Amino acid sequence: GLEALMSSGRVDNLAVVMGLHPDYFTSFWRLHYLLLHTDGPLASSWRHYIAIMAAARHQCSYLVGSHMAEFLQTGGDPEWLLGLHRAPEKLRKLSEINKLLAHRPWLITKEHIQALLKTGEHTWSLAELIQALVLLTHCHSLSSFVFGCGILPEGDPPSEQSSPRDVEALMERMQQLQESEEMESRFELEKSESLPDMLCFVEDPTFGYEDFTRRGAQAPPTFRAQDYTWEDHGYSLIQRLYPEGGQLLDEKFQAAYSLTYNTIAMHSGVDTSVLRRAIWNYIHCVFGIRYDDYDYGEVNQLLERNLKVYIKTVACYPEKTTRRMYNLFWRHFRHSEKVHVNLLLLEARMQAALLYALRAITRYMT
Ligand SMILES: CC(C)(C[C@H](N)C(=O)O)C(F)F
């Protein structure tokens, strides 16, 4: 870990906890320095205010307070802190797509995109729009991480949760798998399986993953992953429209997926990719992405009930994550590994939210 930096306490609590995984932290920092503290299509103030709007969706005062203050240090019109109504209209057209990216990103559709790029008084460029989707999706994923890891605000420990044998059954069930049409059905099962200043920076403040305008549970339309992967499509679209951070996203996703230490709590010497794949592929399943190679039954085999709850809660309702919830799962796993799960899920989530919105753009582009 980056002990010296972490306890320097010249970087915020969020960044401290990321330090627990230096190989992720580097890719994390590059994107964060970029989005918030480097040139690019939108002015600093706008990038910080966009960050507020995304953070607001999960009532995440860590990121809202933070960005309010950056917005202010960077000479933002302090009147925008009184609510969206005072923001410029261009920045408010973003609310619809902000909401959806946060909660139901599968609902993003060419019309939503065509709304922004609709040539009017102040219009979004694709360059600007892409930066904003990266900004929105980033502060969402960082809201997950913030509640997920119990990250504490700076104003007066750096988390209320981290603090800087079924385990051997799990290692067995991993073994068997690595030793090796109803796959379309197992997906539909797993997907359907069910588990206040800020308000003036949002629309529809109660819109969430779950729909309370329909009886029964929420399950998003199944989407065949390989109609529009990051690898084949979304990356290419971003490096054409927001190159300087297209690569930093492809690098971050790569860094989170492939981050292993070959450790699985007590044990050295293990290949965990099966288990990592299962966390990844599940979270995508929660947002409706079905990979046609995956035996989606591997999920229930490998991810315990409490993990799935925490994961889904951090992904879909991070506001509602709690200490109980945090300890209740993987009782015997190291804290660091708890944090690792957060990395996996934030990147998995961000990628889905993006991919839906990129696909939306690629649709309006035709
Ligand atoms: C299983 C775990 C903890 C990863 C593990 N620390 C590893 O080294 O691969 C992660 F996938 F949650």
Residue numbers in the entry: 66 to 221, 233 to 240, 256 to 271, 281 to 295, 310 to 480
What does the literature reporting this entry say, word for word?
Sestrins are a small family of stress-inducible proteins that impact multiple biological processes including oxidative stress, the DNA damage response, metabolic homeostasis and mTORC1 signaling (reviewed in1). Sestrins are thought to directly bind and negatively inhibit GATOR2 thus, releasing its inhibition of the GAP-activity of GATOR1 resulting in inhibition of mTORC1.
The binding pose of NV-5138 is also largely conserved with the free amine and carboxyl groups making similar interactions as leucine and the side chain with the γ-difluoromethyl carbon making additional van der Waals interactions within the hydrophobic region of the leucine-binding pocket. Further confirmation of binding by NV-5138 and leucine was obtained by isothermal calorimetry (ITC) measurements, resulting in estimated Kd values of 1.49 µM and 1.55 µM, respectively. Similar to leucine, addition of NV-5138 to immunoprecipitated Sestrin2/GATOR2 complexes rapidly disrupts the Sestrin2/GATOR2 interaction in a dose-dependent manner. The NV-5138 binding mode to Sestrin2 is consistent with the leucine binding mode and subsequent activation of mTORC1 is correlated with disruption of Sestrin2 binding with GATOR2. Taken together, our data is consistent with NV-5138 directly binding to Sestrin2 which facilitates its disassociation from GATOR2 and subsequently activates mTORC1.
